[PDB]
Amino acid sequence: EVPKKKFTGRCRLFVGNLPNEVKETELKELFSPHGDIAECYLSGKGFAFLRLDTRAHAESAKEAIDGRIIHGRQVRVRFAVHGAAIRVKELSPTVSNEMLYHAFSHFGDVERAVHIVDEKGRPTGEGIVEFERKPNCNEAMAAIRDKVFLLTASPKPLICEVLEPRDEDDGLAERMIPRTPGLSKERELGPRFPTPNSFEYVYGMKWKELYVVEQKRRAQLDEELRESRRRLESDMELAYQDYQAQML
Amino acid sequence: EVPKKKFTGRCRLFVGNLPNEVKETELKELFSPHGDIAECYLSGKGFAFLRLDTRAHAESAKEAIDGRIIHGRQVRVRFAVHGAAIRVKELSPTVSNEMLYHAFSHFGDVERAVHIVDEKGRPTGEGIVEFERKPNCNEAMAAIRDKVFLLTASPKPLICEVLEPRDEDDGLAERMIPRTPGLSKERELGPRFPTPNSFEYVYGMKWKELYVVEQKRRAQLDEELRESRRRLESDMELAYQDYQAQML
Structure with a gap:
């Protein structure tokens, strides 16, 4: 009944730092190995848009072309924001x-x-x-x-x-993390299981206890609300049955 | 630099209803247009497993081959369950x-x-x-x-x-939904905005009121637990500072 749609917003890629000598023909040539292209837009301002036929072909194009040196410029290929x-x-x-x-x-x-x-x-x-x-x-x-x-x-x-x-x-x-002294301080100690003879163990056990309370309260709340719904669903079924009986 | 791993569990495809005449070579031929292949397994019991190099090549292979008629048999391609x-x-x-x-x-x-x-x-x-x-x-x-x-x-x-x-x-x-009389009953009325002169509007407004209560209670709970954390984080900072001062 519903056909699989091609060249959708999820198939839209953004291309940064693109040489302006790269025209539509060359852009299609560059992305063509990955799939069929439509909606080619070239700004002439160092950036470009294009759509591949499927999200899978667009992911493949992104992964193979992002970071590639085109005519002396490192290009950036990323998925354009859908927004709809x-x-x-x-x-x-x-x-x-x-x-x-x-x-x-x-x-x-x-x-x-x-x-x-x-x-x-x-x-x-x-x-x-x-x-x-x-x-x-x-x-x-x-x-x-x-x-x-x-x-x-x-x-x-x-x-x-x-x-x-x-x-x-x-x-x-790792590269995206702003390097600060506090960051070097936290990385002084690495992945480990603390021991009861260590000061930090008492504080890690306090955190584990806290996570159990959090989960328990959320599970308690969900069961209050899940039951409130069950009572509403019941009252509605009874009233609808009564109403449909008077609408004969 | 952690390298991007190839032929991963997420790249693992399951191929169902395979005519047993289709040997390893024919399966390689059929999936090769989509990408490179590893972990090729042929049961001889109608099903098969294979790995494309990337999840994107594996999604493309699934989407192009699922439902295809190979030697007179309707094949079914799907992503194998990771489990790890x-x-x-x-x-x-x-x-x-x-x-x-x-x-x-x-x-x-x-x-x-x-x-x-x-x-x-x-x-x-x-x-x-x-x-x-x-x-x-x-x-x-x-x-x-x-x-x-x-x-x-x-x-x-x-x-x-x-x-x-x-x-x-x-x-x-739609095909996956078990067809029953109750299902035909619910589809008697379609997508609509009910009016105040309609019986169901009072019950739809009761549901909207309920969603506001749930969201309100969840937001209340999150703020209790979020505060509890802020108090723990404070007590820990104070104790750690005092401890590190006595450990000089």
Whole structure:
């Protein structure tokens, strides 16, 4: 039903420190081994944009071309910021990828809609929505946040939030850490298991105790709220059954 | 400089419904357009395993070959389960990718170690550790869970958990949903904004109110625990300063 979309915002790469002699033909030549290209933009101001057909071809192009010396200039290849992505929550276990796609297709052209599942394949109640255009995304997000938006017969509304990107690929490189004396002080002692005859062990056991309390309180809160929901779900089922009985 | 490792567990593909006439050579031919190959295994029992050089080449191979008709059989390509991945928490904002790599390199050969950062590039306190071997991972996880393990001079211990993979790529396809009468009932009403003259609006407003309470309580709890930490951090700084003064 929903075809796999090509040259999306997730397939967009940014190219820094690019020689201005490098024209569109040479840029395509350089990225062509990785996949089909579209949306070539050359600024003439040392930077460029381009889209590969798939995120996988774009990751491969980034990994092979970032740091390469082109006509005497070290280029930088990075994924361009999407800026039109939503974190959907309170999704029903029956709301498919396709259901989520056409529902958000009301707000504008959608690139991808997915209902995330665990290792076991069970729905998580969380989903991702990516729009081709940023104001359409802002519209979808603002409307659903302000008013009750229902995907099914169920009165449970959707929650929409900005899908803040996380860097699990590059993370915190040693080079990015500002070098200070305090930093050298913390690296004087390295990876170790402290012993009870050491001063720091008593303080590390205090921290371990703290993490157990934190987890325990969070688990307690989740069970209070998870039960509050179970009572609401019950009251609603009983009232809806009663209402549908008087609507015959 | 920690080099980028090739033919990793994340690069490991599972190939299902393979006609047994397809030998190692035919499998190499078929996957070669996507990249270089290692760990080629052919069961002779309809399934297979192989490793592309990079996750990006392996995603590209999966996406191009999954569902393809080879010698009259519908093949199914998927990423094989890693099973040697850790979710590290309570990471210091100064523990880099490299620090995390060599620290866990004590437990065994590590494939990848990353301290995850936000869009802004700031450390999240969360990281990912992937080992070449599953027993080594189980060892690292069990030791750090049982005893206090310190990466820096700081008495704050590491938390290690099983990195349960999430399917953000395939998710919940409509086809995977068991078709029942209750499912047809929920899809009788589609994506909509209910109106105050509708019975369901009062129940959708009850749900919106509930989400505000949950968020409020969670934010209250986080601020109790966040303060508790600030008080512990203070008591420790004062005691460590006084201790280091008597250790001169």
